[PDB]
Amino acid sequence: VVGTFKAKDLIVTPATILKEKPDPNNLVFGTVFTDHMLTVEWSSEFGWEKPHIKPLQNLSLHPGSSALHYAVELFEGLKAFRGVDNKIRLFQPNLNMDRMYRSAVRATLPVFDKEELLECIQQLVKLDQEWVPYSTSASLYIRPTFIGTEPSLGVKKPTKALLFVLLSPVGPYFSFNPVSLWANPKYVRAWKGGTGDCKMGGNYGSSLFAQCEAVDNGCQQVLWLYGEDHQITEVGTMNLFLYWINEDGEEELATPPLDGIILPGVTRRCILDLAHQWGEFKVSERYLTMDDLTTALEGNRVREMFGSGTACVVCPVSDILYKGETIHIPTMENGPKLASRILSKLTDIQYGREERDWTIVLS
């Protein structure tokens, strides 16, 4: 009956005892949580309950919950930034609401009003705003999560769900400290006709084995390969950019196209928009193979390779382990000039050093 929850209906239960904030420079990504969380219950019978901001607490879930059996779940990732003017800003948060709604439809989780969820998120951040670090290299990570909670082993559209939001203060990185990539084509992240273009939990559970194999070989991320010609698709959890002289001898920033096996990153979209705006080199959404890359390296045609994502912004790549060899990528010996310029521009926008359509000041 209640088609969507409304921020105007928020019930706020503040915590009695507030926790000590961590040192911004000693932060391990996603291990520290703020005082409060957002929860909103849904049922097929009654629709959306009123949204709650309350102290961070365990979830009480029926052990038959479809999130635990059939990965009926999705998540988002976005950040709050304390500006040089001390105003807290979100970055492109409507793109995260759009993507979460699209993910929910694909997961068969109940739809919600995107503007009402964003307002509830703003009110949660506002309450916990002293967690948004006083540092131009740290931020508050925002993790909207949406799970099936129906107490039934049936394989079907859930009749019960929980939408919740966690906040986690994070440093500039995770622990330019460049990443080594593990490339093993025996493992495939995502396929045409699959859900790799949605942020659904199921995409990541199936990717964990390759990630643990990467870390066992001293690599931080998996280079995700696709098809008989070994297309390079994603830098682990991040979109893939290659800055090089292409086959026609033109300076080019290249990234794989949104053909269904690529997560359409907010950071990816912003980087393409900046590169188009600058007009200093060719910008191509195009297929890239291991053979394209190794042929280019042998011709000294590669300048830079980096991943893009909310957590890293720009993540330079120095090495790829492939067929038993270490292939060096000369990113850090080429500046990295473009990676640095992109990171400078995005952080200038995020921390309010310049005005942008891409940021909103916290309500």
Ligand X SMILES: *Cc1c(COP(=O)(O)O)cnc(C)c1O
Ligand Y SMILES: Cc1ccccc1Oc1cc(-n2c(=O)cc(S(=O)(=O)c3ccccc3)[nH]c2=O)c(F)cc1C#N
3-state secondary structure of 137: coil
Of 155-163, 301-309, 316-324, 325-333: span binding a copy of itself (CB under 8 A): 155-163
Token duo for residue 225 = 């390969």
Q: Which residue lies nearer to Mg ion by CB, 49 or 113?
A: 113
Binding mask 111-130 for Mg ion (x = CB under 5 A): --x-----------------
Minimum CB separation of residue 332 from ligand Y in Å reads 15
3-state secondary structure of 190: coil
Cα distances (angstroms) measured from residue 212 to each of 177, 220, 225, 317: 20, 9, 17, 19
* Total number of residues shown for the chain: 363
| Residue type present at position 92 | Q
Write out the binding residues for Mg ion, residues 313-332 only, by CB under 5 A.
Answer: none
Closest CA to 134 of 233, 23, 241: 23
H helix runs in 128-265, sequence order: 202-205, 208-216
263 binds ligand X (CB under 6 A): yes
Q: Which residue lies nearer to a copy of itself by CB, 122 or 145?
A: 145
* Segment (H or E) for 74: strand 73-75
Main-chain dihedrals φ then ψ at residue 135, nearest 5 degrees: -165, 135
Q: Single out the residue of 311, 338, 342, 349 in contact with ligand Y (rule: CB under 6 A).
A: 311
Write out the binding residues for ligand X, residues 322-351 only, by CB under 6 A.
Answer: none
Minimum CB separation of residue 240 from ligand X in Å reads 9
Question: Residue number with the shortest CB distance to ligand X?
Answer: 265
Is-contact 189 198, C-beta < 8 A? no
Give the Cβ contact number of residue 232 at 10 Å: 23
Of 34-42, 146-154, 283-291, 302-310: span binding ligand X (CB under 6 A): 302-310
157 binds a copy of itself (CB under 8 A): yes
Token duo for residue 113 = 């009003």
Minimum CB separation of residue 69 from ligand Y in Å reads 7
Distance CA 242, CA 290 (A): 12
Minimum CB separation of residue 357 from Mg ion in Å reads 22
- The residue to which tokens 């921020």 are assigned: 7
- Which residues have C-beta within 8 Å of that of residue 60, sequence separation ≥ 6? none
- Residue 239 binding: pick among Mg ion, ligand Y, ligand X, none (C-beta 5-8 Å cut-off by kind): ligand X
Give the Cβ contact number of residue 216 at 10 Å: 9
Of 68-76, 90-98, 251-259, 351-359: span binding a copy of itself (CB under 8 A): 68-76
Q: Which residue lies nearer to ligand Y by CB, 154 or 260?
A: 154
Distance CA 216, CA 8 (A): 49
Q: Which residue lies nearer to ligand Y by CB, 36 or 199?
A: 199
Closest CA to 182 of 154, 220, 139: 220
Write out the binding residues for a copy of itself, residues 134-153 only, by CB under 8 A.
Answer: 141, 143, 145, 147, 151-153
Cα distances (angstroms) measured from residue 343 to each of 31, 202, 353: 25, 31, 13
Angle at 200 between CA 360 and CA 350, to 5 degrees: 20
Of 52-60, 137-145, 241-249, 264-272: span binding ligand X (CB under 6 A): 264-272
Which residues bind to ligand Y, rule: CB under 6 A? 29-30, 77, 153-155, 174-175, 179, 204, 211, 215, 220-221, 236-237, 309-311
Which residues bind to a copy of itself, rule: CB under 8 A? 28-31, 33, 37, 56-73, 75, 106-108, 141, 143, 145, 147, 151-157, 164, 166, 168, 185-188, 191-195, 200-209, 211-212, 215, 236-237
Which residues bind to ligand X, rule: CB under 6 A? 77, 199, 234, 237-239, 263, 265-268, 308-310
Which residues bind to Mg ion, rule: CB under 5 A? 113
